[PDB]
Ligand binder design. Structure first.
Ligand SMILES: CCCCCCCCCCCCCCCCCC(=O)OC[C@H](COP(=O)([O-])OCC(O)COP(=O)([O-])OC[C@@H](COC(=O)CCCCCCCCCCCCCCCCC)OC(=O)CCCCCCCCCCCCCCCCC)OC(=O)CCCCCCCCCCCCCCCCC
Lengths: 37, 110
């Protein structure tokens, strides 16, 4: 009976944040194809 | 150049409010053409005094560069009093809006 003394949802499996987004003029994590001049 | 003290005194009288009422009374029966002609005549009288008296008279500030130095000094005073003040204000404005040097930032990279 003590198994039901305390289930809204669950904790998130993964999280995404702003610092995970890349930035940089030279950083190749932002370069897919060259932008025309 | 000459009569800088008189010019300072003129500015003082102009800022004095009582002189505002005096000028309001003097402007009774007066035209914009007359006012403009009077101001232009005053300026011409100053410059003509200079042109005439520089031929034979020397002021206390006479120097091997003549009135060029007095004119440069007038310009430098104007600069430091007005333009550098405006620069200070603009600097504080830019530093509050974008950060120091924000007006010289490079465009956002693409
Ligand atoms: C601080 C300087 C730096 C300024 C900021 C930086 C700017 C750099 C750019 C410079 C550009 C200069 C502008 C050039 C344009 C032409 C200007 C010009 O020739 O006519 C000026 C003008 C002269 O008018 P004028 O048409 O030739 O007619 C002359 C009269 O007939 C009278 O006839 P007179 O024969 O009896 O005398 C003729 C003449 C005689 O002028 C002279 O020959 C100078 C006599 C002394 C020789 C050594 C000069 C330098 C060292 C002593 C003076 C220190 C002050 C610096 C003065 C710089 C100008 C030389 O009279 C004067 O000019 C008096 C000036 C000295 C006033 C002293 C006031 C002391 C208060 C400040 C505390 C002490 C100083 C603190 C330390 C500052 C260090 C930077 O001088 C005035 O300022 C008129 C004052 C009217 C009364 C105002 C109420 C009193 C307030 C006193 C301060 C007045 C403003 C001066 C500010 C400087 C002191 C803080």
């Amino acid at each position: 009976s003590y198994l039901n003394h305390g289930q809204n949802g669950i904790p998130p499996s993964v999280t995404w944040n702003f610092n995970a987004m890349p930035y940089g003029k030279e950083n190749p994590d932002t370069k897919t194809f060259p932008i025309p001049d | 150049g000459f009569h800088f003290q008189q010019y300072i005194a003129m500015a003082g009288r102009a800022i004095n409010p009582v002189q505002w009422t005096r000028a309001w009374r003097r402007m009774e029966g007066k035209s914009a053409t007359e006012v403009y002609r009077d101001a232009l005549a005053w300026t011409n009288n100053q410059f003509a005094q200079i042109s005439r008296a520089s031929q034979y008279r020397a002021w206390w500030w006479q120097n091997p560069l003549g009135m060029g130095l007095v004119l440069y000094g007038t310009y430098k005073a104007w600069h430091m009093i007005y333009m550098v003040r405006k620069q200070k204000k603009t600097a504080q404005l830019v530093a509050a809006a974008y950060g120091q040097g924000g007006q010289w930032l490079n465009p956002v990279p693409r």
